[PDB]
């Protein structure tokens, strides 16, 4: 859109003298008073430059894997939420490995994990049900917990209004199948399960409610969604053998 | 407030005619407008929606248990701070613990600590005093190292407007009397600090001061505010023997 | 249109902490806002819905049967209006009878007709015309009465702006050929004439004219506009026999 | 008004090259913007569209015949209403008739009443009293009922700020002097009276009051207002004989 | 509110001079220019004032009486309306007269009936269920006639946001308790079945559906709602003998 | 766009009463509104009519024709410009007149050329390069002169946005094919060279630069651009013979 | 208008205290105001002031001496123009001459033509015709050459909104009565012709049309219209002899 | 000004998370803002954008020569004018000639003048006299002939605000010292004088008085201006002989 995108008009001379299109001097007009009116806030932002906002990632840096791992469907009663997934330690890095690796490999470059998510899209199953959904969630656990199927609504996270709620699980406890920049190698689950210090602690116990004041059928998608950095060279792929 | 809360305006039939409130109609022509409004505006969302922004933790996700420790007075110099707590690491320890478990006992639910917050309540004790408040802080020492009593204001933290000032203590250093999630055991405090790998090492040294230049005699309440995320089951609390 | 249709944002975790889009808070902010600006002008709205509007019946209740009768083309002079209909009551409820019952039978379902209306599509002949079009019209007249072919403009019913004009024949006089919700039977047009009382009275004479200073030639499509309430069973058409 | 009504600026070449008047050209941008402004509201006007208003008819369709029948002068008690008159049915249609047949006659026209209106022209005795006028009516009563001077104020009609308050008596129950489109005819009142079905039922028991807190003399000019639709051909009236 | 009530300010005489409240000038200010701005638009006003709005009866004119019938509950499919009542006109007239009379009576006040009509007020059963209710209705059948339990949707009637509707039934047709103003006689049910022309014809057929996509269970309160204008004397109720 | 281009909303009569759309009212308001506004400002306009513009010729009066001679790429270095043609006269009248003819021939209808125009299409030779163009010319020179390949940039005519320049050589001094209106004749380049008084004078010498602080390679396409006036008959092309 | 034409308000003194009208400080505001809102928008103007706008020489310099020539009426066809005059040269300077001397003399002052215009005022010939008018003229042509007398709209000038256009003939090829400032001379139309050194070839050749789609009657004055520089000295008309 | 000249805000990485400064974001809002307040003005702009202005020549293309030639002071009555200069065609060219060439030699470059100017910069000789000042002038005048030294205003020129007035002396009967682009040649004013077709002829007699109703003395600084279009090689002066 903006279809003249700020190169409106022409020019041309008449004897000698020069001629500009009238709406390209009403921009110089505007853009000089939008400049203007930026210096009168110009201190508002020097101000407001005291402080930052955060990229979102998804709309942002790093590649974007989103390997879903099952669909599940709760009946959430009101000022209840429902548990989304119970596994032990060693079910949660079976299928963490399992599925990243087969959906991901071939891994032709190098590349680093910046941040691992716990995705939740969550879609109510009923039209006409005007609410909003809530979360709550546990990272680690004693391995021999398994997590209360329902509790009660008491200071969830509020999810966002398009339904999408991303829980990230942090380097700080947490194996990854590539902890930082490395080549990809032979790598199989076993070799990997014996690496992890704290298999069977760290496992997320997450929950879904609603703000709804009836029973509610939710469909909920649940993903591990990879935030890479790649570094693929800027080198072609030659059919072997090269040149 | 706003009473007729978007559902003003009736209906009615007048000879198969049909008849709306002039104010309901009034309202489909702002919203309408505002929607519009919100279009022409899209875009710009579209470029904000870019960025994100945290949410407050204390009007948020978590429970609000702030375990008070003591109260304290100073005089602080102008451009100076004065130190809040000089405690040990086995000190500080003894504290954290002692004052969370008394205070959170009976924990009858399971839980996990999202995290530990250092929080400074902070009041002028003179009236018409017009300043704001400031803070530093160290969070972990060198265990045979006490700070100094008084320090020069240097690029301190500036205390937001409400004089209350939170900070955190990362679980990548300190340990939780609950680090996850975990039902809770027979505990005691030299259980505790046995399992404290680095018990007299993290201990937060903090120190506030305030942007006056005349001398402030300042009161400060300190807590200990966990954000607790508490997994309590949807079940009712029987007397005994259920059933 | 507004595509993130007031849904936009999403929402993250990063170490425990809740992350929101910005432009979503955006939003929050503005709806907010619109409804704090709602709150000042709500008297205003309890004083306008003190008072109340007529829904576009060809826009709202009822279902649109559109009978068109017949073409005419007419030279309008000046401050002139000309007659568009001049028939007897005998001939005007054989062409209702007729062109309605024709053209919408089968009559698959009980129904009502809400209101019969004498409709006028008015285009002008020449381009570059800037008027518009005025009306004036009798229900009923003595039976022996004919209209003028041409008066003068005196206190006309201004069209509106699309130059459309529908002009009810109430149920206050006008035979109807299903007088209110029934059945639909075994009608020939002799048992319709022999059941209205008042055949020959009841007859629209309708006139037409312009705003404009010259001779006009102008275009009058005619149509009978039924606005029917239909009672159609929520069930299936079958096949005979039925099972 | 608005005096270069749209048609401002002129035109002139010089050596083969254009030029325009400069307000013109501003025109041009406002007119071009309003219609910018139109399109970004046309979707609310879409909306607005889908409701209705109603032509004043004193301002609009059909001539303007006031009939003038009586002044009348009240002492209004506080939350009272005077009865401003008590007629049989008989001799409201001795006046209605005799008074709209003297004062219109001669008919020169075919004409049609399009409704039949009870005018109240209110006007304040006293200067510096600020207060609205009210309204109660019957149309039709038992004949031998006749209304009490004096009722307290209950939900009365609160007439516009102009202080002209309009009642029609519909045609469904009260006889016209000529109760559609006719040739005017020789017209006693005696045959009129015993061509209404109802004579003595259908009278208009009209009473006024105001929003004052004081005794209010007031003063009430009464009319009948014809609204009628004249079919007056678009011919001469020539002296005799015609040719 | 507003509390000084535009009487806002005082004045004093200083050594012969006056001096007024700056407040009180700032109000001189504001209203001369309310009014300045009202001149401007005082020709939009002209052109608005050609076209008039209804006065919300239930807001206005008239004595509120709303005889509530009976309450039902409906399960309704999507895009389909069910049915209210389905009473024989023999069975409407004797609900209308009976609950009417039995809990307007002792009438002790001269009155007329403005409108008699039909109301609906819908709820909900189910919380967070974002819809509008849709209406359609026969005033009219044939007797023998008996409605459908549920029909599809086909250009209904689009209920207002407060869930109330109300649908009046013309003088022209429904035979009424008290027809115009009259004493309250000796009445009962037979004497007035006997004097309706049309009992078994003219009673009331209605539909309710919604706008959700779901079934929803939907609460239906029907009243009917009598607009009385009472002609109640301003005189006391003395305890007789009177004097 | 703007779809009821002003003609919006529809009218109908109920029971003679005459009904309009609410939307097309709302225009009523705005259109009178905005009249009013041009009221206010109808002053303002006097005083701006005071002065005109000069309309683009090549959105405007004459015909468009641009006879392309060829294309030329310049290394520009900064603060210079680079000469874009250095023809002789009788070199660049070889190059006007076979260009111009070859392209427009066969002229078939009467013609008069209002202004011959040196047109600069100008394109950067990089992306990323932020920067205006500049121009400089003389349009007659000693004939035995040439000019420098490269100048230095000294209060140039600043190109237009869209970065075409057009230069017009005036009837005083250059002549044309066809200098006024004239049916087209039998012509060839030596008897227009023989007519043209001063053959070898008037040759456009048209400089380039830029407004960058880097050498610019830049693509200079190069037309002239004649506006010609057509005086073309309302007359059918035949096939011969004609009838 | 603007009465108090910027000096409102009055001053005085009481008690050696100065007083000062409240409104006339309102001035004070607003006017430093104003030119505070000119100091912001200053740096605009200096980028507006790098640009120049034409005077409309009829409302500034120079005398308006319009000496019409005739009037004329066409028939134009849609997308066509009608030529106004097909003079020989002999036969426009015979005109030219004789219409401004005749109705010039006497030339009692000193005074140089600074422009020459051919003026048409254009006017529709019939009411509620909406369109405009449109130009294309020939200023010289060969002196055998007459134009057609219809032609087809290509790229015609648009003429103002006031339906007047000017057409300046230029001083480069156009002879004048009085080519420069001269005293007035002995002057018969012989002499004129035998000075003009083109007497044959300069003659303007005007067409109109309109933007109309329909056959539309036009009137077309025309006029020439003289813009003089007049030198009258500042010295009385004397009755001879002087002194 | 503008200091962060719309490079405000810088960006950071904590632990992977990208986050950039707000004040930054708010433009990122604003500018995305401002252009989609240019797409609903971008029509406007095309209208607009069918008109063009001119460009300020002495801000503007070409070099700014101001070759002064005298002051003077004269006494103005009201409305009238007084001549600033009377020169014989002669003693114009004298002074052109030789004011041009001692102030410009050495002309060291190639050089075309694109326009002649004659310059009035005009003053008030008291203060505290608010008016403007008016202008007249002939180009050219018999040579025998002198002008009024005093005339009446009629029509004139209204000067700018800043009190300068710039009149051109076209390239059509003027000769310039140089005519186009040409080397400077061995040249001397008797040369000059017999190249001049019409020395005698071509000579500015020019006017000024005022819009004040009282005489004042004003002063009238006169320059020639000269603008140029220079055409200096991009080569460096070398002191002899080179390399």
């Given amino acids: 859109s903006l279809r003249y995108s700020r190169h409106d008009g022409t020019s041309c001379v ?24 930026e210096a009168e806030y110009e201190p508002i932002i020097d101000i407001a430059d005291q402080y930052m906002v955060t990229e979102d990632p998804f709309r942002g840096p790093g590649k974007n894997v989103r390997i879903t791992l099952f669909k599940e ?49 969550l879609r109510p199953m009923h039209p006409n049900r005007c609410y909003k959904f809530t979360m709550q969630y546990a990272l680690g ?7 209360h199927d329902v509790i009660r609504q ?17 380097k700080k406890g947490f194996a990854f199948p590539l902890t930082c920049l490395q080549s990809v190698y032979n790598d199989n689950f076993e070799r990997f399960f014996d690496d992890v210090l704290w298999p069977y602690f ?4 997450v929950y879904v409610g609603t703000t709804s004041a009836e029973i509610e059928e939710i469909m909920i998608e649940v993903s591990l969604l990879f935030k890479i950095k790649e570094f693929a060279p800027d080198v072609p792929l030659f059919t072997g053998p090269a040149y």
Same sequence: chains 1, 2, 3, 4, 5, 6, 7, 8.
């Fill in 73 to 121: 469907i709760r009946r959430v009663h009101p000022d209840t939420m429902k548990l989304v997934c119970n596994w032990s330690g060693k079910e949660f890095l079976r299928e963490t490995w399992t599925r990243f690796i087969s959906e991901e490999f071939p891994i032709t470059t190098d590349q680093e994990i910046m941040d691992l998510w716990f995705e939740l899209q």
């Fill in 14 to 37: 008449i004897d000698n003298h020069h001629l500009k299109s009238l709406g390209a001097v009403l921009n110089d007009v505007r853009r000089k008073k939008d400049r203007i009116r």
């Fill in 202 to 205: 760290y496992r997320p116990l």
């Fill in 154 to 170: 008491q200071d969830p996270y509020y999810v966002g209004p398009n339904n999408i709620e991303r829980i990230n699980l942090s």
């Fill in 141 to 147: 656990a004693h391995p021999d917990y398994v997590a």
